[PDB]
Structure 1
Amino acid sequence: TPEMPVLENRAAQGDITAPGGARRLTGDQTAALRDSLSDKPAKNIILLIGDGMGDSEITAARNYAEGAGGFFKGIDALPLTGQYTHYALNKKTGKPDYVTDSAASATAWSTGVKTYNGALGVDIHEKDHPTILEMAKAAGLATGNVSTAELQDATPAALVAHVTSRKCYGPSATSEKCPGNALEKGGKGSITEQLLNARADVTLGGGAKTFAETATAGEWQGKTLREQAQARGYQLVSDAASLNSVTEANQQKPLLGLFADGNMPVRWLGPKATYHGNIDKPAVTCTPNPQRNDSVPTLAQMTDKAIELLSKNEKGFFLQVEGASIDKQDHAANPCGQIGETVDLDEAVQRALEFAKKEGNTLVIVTADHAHASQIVAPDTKAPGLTQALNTKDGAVMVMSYGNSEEDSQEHTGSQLRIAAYGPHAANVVGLTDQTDLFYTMKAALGLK
């Protein structure tokens, strides 16, 4: 018997050149929004993060993949929407730092405490705070952590690791850069070792590389981290076939999927933007990445599999899904990569909403940790940074610009950005909120203490 509505179609409803033809609405929305509002408990939460997916990125991806008056059946379909702030803190002064990195922002929603750029799961005093995943597990809920990034990267790592620098992937980086955290120094360990201790029911991503490192101390000293996971009873999987053979995931047999050495394959290929690229180079049509095939699960497939396995828990589950970006160095300023990454997340969102609509007790939240610096500019633009012309689904040219930095490691900005939600307690993302409110929203929705 009918659940809360997901937005079915907010594409332009007609001929965009005619009066009323670009409308996305067909009538009054007051009843629809009423029907979207419930304060019943959330049994499950699915949190989907698009790396750099601020409003500009969503718009550009829509323009390219769906056309300007098109509609992302995942990303655009959430009925309750707001804007949230994600400033970090200066470690020394405690004053706002207007432009966060991925680590401080993931720390904020996962713990409810602001922190300094580069911190995971700790505050500006380097004190550990519990994460929403740890708390969900302690309350008897199943837990999932899914990303197309290496699993040691900030977004997934923040759910399961407490370290003073996001660089602390394995034992060697930790001994050097976070000596207070190093296992041999009485610390909780590297990000990978702490992930293994956290023992979520389902962990799926890239990052096999670090598992080749050996532990410096503890029960599994001298064993590779892969050997340690094996010894501690994880089901290790490495491709789509081995993932699909998994029939259950729980504390006795926790699932750890390592699908790439570093990050998983980008969906779409295209050239790096160049100086006056929209003027001096032909318009670009993105191409499918050959590395992307049925042997490597997609974000949407990993999401579906996680939902399948976690939904067996009768108490409920918490799942985080990250559509990560490979957006630095040779890979910075790549519209095709960045748009394809958003399309990937859209598919995963559709899987999440399809489940949530049927199940009826699931809160789905879709946002970004911080926004990419890409801008949509006029077709004839002469811009001082990097630009590219693209052939969109509309059969028109869109130009994207990257003008925030002359170096190719600063890819994000301080702008507040869209947060959207569906299901019980979704009212809590509407209007202006802070990224730290997201922690408290999730905590309260699941009834965690």
Structure 2
Amino acid sequence: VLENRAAQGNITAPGGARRLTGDQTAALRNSLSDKPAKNIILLIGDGMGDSEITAARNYAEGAGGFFKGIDALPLTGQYTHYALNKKTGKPDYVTDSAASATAWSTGVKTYNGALGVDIHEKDHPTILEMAKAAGLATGNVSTAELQHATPAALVAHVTSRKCYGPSATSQKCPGNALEKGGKGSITEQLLNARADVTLGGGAKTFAETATAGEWQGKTLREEAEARGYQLVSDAASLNSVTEANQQKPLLGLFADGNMPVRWLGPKATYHGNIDKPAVTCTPNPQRNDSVPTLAQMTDKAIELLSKNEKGFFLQVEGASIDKQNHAANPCGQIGETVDLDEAVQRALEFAKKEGNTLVIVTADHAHASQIVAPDTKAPGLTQALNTKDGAVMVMSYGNSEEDSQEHTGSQLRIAAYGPHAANVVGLTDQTDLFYTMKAALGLK
């Protein structure tokens, strides 16, 4: 159950590349507790499979390096995340972000694109709803639009992930449309759910006016305000918040759509590792210092949430690892994995100090990026990068001739620290996670 897993010394020497300093048995035994968890922090790396973790560690920490956050969780396993074909009820081997998020948030598999409903389109209670009912404070943070599938899945039940605001819901989710007697769009359901802390992007959908209900005629932003939400839009105002609860829930909208990525780098290109020079990532100039980082949002949320005596449930998402993978941009993708790692560190620090917090880090599904040899002549998009080791690493994206690289169906890493973390070991399913969390918090 060690906390340092970097190579011991000279990687060219016998025992120099070892990450273990001694026998794990006793330490591992010491880290196994079935006592209840008072708090739960679930961090999700959207599209962050074992390959994405390996490529980012290699680049930012070196092959023999180690992520202080991501690599430091002691109990590890692999889990399945296949979705279901809506018509046949048969497995669909490659899930989208919607079906997987619904799986761990409700405990039931579903079809790609479904948010909070099963294949029969019937609603099921999310872990956040249950937490909130039991008295626990709740948080939902992401670097994506708050309407994005992952944060959405905890607070909305729609038949199609595209039902962002009133206008799209009427056309695509008529059965959920407010005017038609439904629960409403994702954004409307988010506002109704009222998690104590909610932070991310997606301010543009809040400019839509409701078509019905008690607040028809007013923009979703006007409604938020009208219903007691504290609205912050940058790091400064985010930091000046001193409390967030059911009387004053916090809602931060730091971007119109998705928040900007941390690093800039060119897009992989065909034979890019051969015909183009190796690249070194640089900071994204389009990203203002006023836009809080994932670690900052995570830290503020933890502070506001831990004020609750009963406990809290918090979900944090590093969204753009997935987005940059789709875009075949190694620097964008790696920068986002580094960003997530910082957030994991904040979580682990609190968890170790507090002692009754279960921390889980995993991804919703695998993705395209592969690490290949320097001289690889590949059919897809490639790019050579200068790593921290002073060596060249080539990344390949070879599963799509279209303008977006695809998710993949491989089982991937799930790691945890704290009470009930043992339930993450061995092979499990993404739906087992819902139950693991439900049982750790003693939720009925």
> TM-score if structure 2 supplies the norm length?
0.99
Q: Cα–Cα, structure 1 residues 97 and 52, in superposed 2: closer, same or farther, change >3 Å?
A: same
Other-structure match for 2:421: 426
CA–CA distance in 2 between the matches of 1:62 and 1:305? 26
Residue 410 of structure 1, CA deviation: 4.2
Deviations 1:34-60 (A, max 9, x none): 111000000000000001110000000
Residue 293 of structure 1, CA deviation: 4.0
CA–CA distance in 2 between the matches of 1:123 and 1:116? 7
Deviations 1:195-243 (A, max 9, x none): 0000000000000000000000001101000000000000000001110
- Indicate the larger mover: 291-300 or 428-437: 291-300
| Amino-acid identity (%) | 98
Q: Cα–Cα, structure 1 residues 330 and 308, in superposed 2: closer, same or farther, change >3 Å?
A: closer
**Which residues of structure 2 form unaligned runs of 5+?**
none
Mapping 1:72-87, distance limit 5 Å: 72-87=67-82
SS at match of 2:179: helix
Other-structure match for 1:3: none
Q: Cα–Cα, structure 1 residues 330 and 46, in superposed 2: closer, same or farther, change >3 Å?
A: closer
- 2:321 and 2:334 in contact (8 A); partners too: no
- 1:327 and 1:334 in contact (8 A); partners too: no
SS at match of 1:124: coil
Q: Cα–Cα, structure 1 residues 91 and 330, in superposed 2: closer, same or farther, change >3 Å?
A: closer
CA–CA distance in 2 between the matches of 1:430 and 1:340? 28
CA–CA distance in 1 between the matches of 2:323 and 2:49? 17
Deviations 1:100-152 (A, max 9, x none): 00000000000000000000000000000000000000000000000000000
- 1:327 and 1:411 in contact (8 A); partners too: no
- 1:110 and 1:131 in contact (8 A); partners too: yes
Residue 445 of structure 1, CA deviation: 0.2
Q: Cα–Cα, structure 1 residues 88 and 331, in superposed 2: closer, same or farther, change >3 Å?
A: closer
Residue 371 of structure 1, CA deviation: 1.2
- 1:108 and 1:436 in contact (8 A); partners too: yes
Query: Does residue 1:443 correspond to 2:442, yes or no?
Result: no
CA–CA distance in 2 between the matches of 1:405 and 1:99? 14
Deviations 1:377-396 (A, max 9, x none): 00000000000000000000
CA–CA distance in 2 between the matches of 1:403 and 1:359? 44
- 1:329 and 1:408 in contact (8 A); partners too: no
Residue 8 of structure 1, CA deviation: 2.4
CA–CA distance in 2 between the matches of 1:265 and 1:135? 32
Residue 9 of structure 1, CA deviation: 1.1
- 2:48 and 2:322 in contact (8 A); partners too: no
CA–CA distance in 1 between the matches of 2:202 and 2:167? 15
- 2:268 and 2:381 in contact (8 A); partners too: yes
CA–CA distance in 1 between the matches of 2:252 and 2:143? 11
Residue of structure 1 aligned with 2:7, choices 12, 22, 26: 12
Query: Does residue 1:367 correspond to 2:394, yes or no?
Result: no
Mapping 1:30-429, distance limit 5 Å: 30-325=25-320, 332-429=327-424
Deviations 1:346-376 (A, max 9, x none): 0000000000000000000000000121000
Residue 265 of structure 1, CA deviation: 1.1
Q: Cα–Cα, structure 1 residues 328 and 142, in superposed 2: closer, same or farther, change >3 Å?
A: closer
Count, aligned residues: 444
Deviations 1:382-441 (A, max 9, x none): 000000000000000000000011113343100000000000000000000000000000
Residue 290 of structure 1, CA deviation: 1.7
CA–CA distance in 1 between the matches of 2:385 and 2:192? 46
- Indicate the larger mover: 217-226 or 403-412: 403-412
Q: Cα–Cα, structure 1 residues 104 and 329, in superposed 2: closer, same or farther, change >3 Å?
A: same
**Which residues of structure 1 form unaligned runs of 5+?**
1-5
SS at match of 1:103: helix
CA–CA distance in 2 between the matches of 1:76 and 1:225? 40
- 1:329 and 1:409 in contact (8 A); partners too: no
CA–CA distance in 1 between the matches of 2:383 and 2:322? 15
- 1:266 and 1:326 in contact (8 A); partners too: no
Residue 291 of structure 1, CA deviation: 3.1
Residue 81 of structure 1, CA deviation: 0.1
Q: Cα–Cα, structure 1 residues 100 and 232, in superposed 2: closer, same or farther, change >3 Å?
A: same
- Indicate the larger mover: 54-63 or 402-411: 402-411
Residue 331 of structure 1, CA deviation: 6.5
CA–CA distance in 2 between the matches of 1:224 and 1:106? 28
Residue 327 of structure 1, CA deviation: 5.3
CA–CA distance in 1 between the matches of 2:64 and 2:259? 31
CA–CA distance in 1 between the matches of 2:193 and 2:186? 10
- 1:80 and 1:427 in contact (8 A); partners too: yes
- 1:148 and 1:322 in contact (8 A); partners too: yes
SS at match of 2:52: helix
RMSD: 1.1
- 1:214 and 1:222 in contact (8 A); partners too: yes
Deviations 1:66-115 (A, max 9, x none): 00000000000000000000000000000000000000000000000000
- 2:322 and 2:367 in contact (8 A); partners too: no
